[PDB]
């Protein structure tokens, strides 16, 4: 996934060069996802108790 | 899918801040709806952005 820096950045180390250009630069992440197929609309969930 | 309930967070630490946020969002909703947002999303659906 390509994204943007969209968090509260830390002004603890207040840099007028890095934390303003890193807003402009992207953010590359790797996640998981689970979809239904394009021809399925019903989710089935089964367990025992 | 268009879900709704768009001001209530799903994870929080405070309760006073949660009530303040929900009454702020209700202040937003009960004098103007989502109509200015909804017709802009309907524009971006209507053309093929």
């Amino acid at each position: 996934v390509r994204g943007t820096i969209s968090n509260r950045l830390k002004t603890k180390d207040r840099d007028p060069a890095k934390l303003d250009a890193s807003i402009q630069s992207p953010n590359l992440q790797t996640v998981d996802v689970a979809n239904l197929p394009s021809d399925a609309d019903t989710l089935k969930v089964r367990f025992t108790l | 899918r268009v879900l709704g309930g768009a001001g209530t967070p799903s994870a929080c630490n405070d309760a006073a801040y949660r009530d303040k946020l929900l009454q702020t969002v209700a202040t937003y909703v009960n004098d103007q709806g989502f109509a200015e947002l909804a017709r802009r999303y309907a524009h971006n659906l209507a053309n093929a952005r």
Binding site: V31, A34, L36, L43 | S10
Partner: protein, 143 residues
């Protein structure tokens, strides 16, 4: 309810098979359970979200299903008109970030259990349902 009660007594056999169907939409995103992985990937070529899978299937943890089943407590003394929460000692809720049923307002599980066993001070019936629900839930206690 009579069958689950006759199973909780210890008298007859009980084994349920629960299936749930949920029409959502074509090709939509379903949400299986995400497992806590504390401090994984000190390299920045990492993986942020990791979903839980039993063998070639998306899955939900068992403790989450049990947490869904024991949302029984309506009797908590902070503000009872907000929905049933899960049965807990110091009866708390992690999404809300707040512990209802606080021992300064003497209605948690330790106070009521000690008054109702050691001192025979019986609480109200509604707090007694909470005290028994912590015994169906189970726990680990000490000195």
């Amino acid at each position: 309810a009579e069958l689950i009660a006759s199973g909780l007594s210890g008298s007859g056999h009980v084994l349920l098979e629960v299936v749930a169907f949920a029409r959502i939409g074509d090709g939509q995103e379903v949400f299986p359970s995400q497992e806590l992985i504390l401090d994984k990937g000190d390299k920045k070529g990492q993986k942020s979200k990791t979903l839980y899978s039993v063998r070639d299937a998306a899955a939900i943890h068992s403790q989450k299903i049990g947490n869904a089943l024991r949302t029984i407590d309506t009797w908590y003394p902070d503000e009872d008109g907000l929905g049933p929460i899960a049965v807990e000692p110091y009866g708390s809720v992690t999404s809300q970030g707040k512990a209802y049923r606080q021992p300064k307002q003497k209605l948690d599980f330790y106070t009521l259990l000690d008054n109702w066993v050691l001192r025979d001070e019986a609480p109200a019936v509604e707090q007694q349902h909470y005290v028994i629900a912590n015994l169906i839930r189970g726990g680990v206690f000490g000195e």
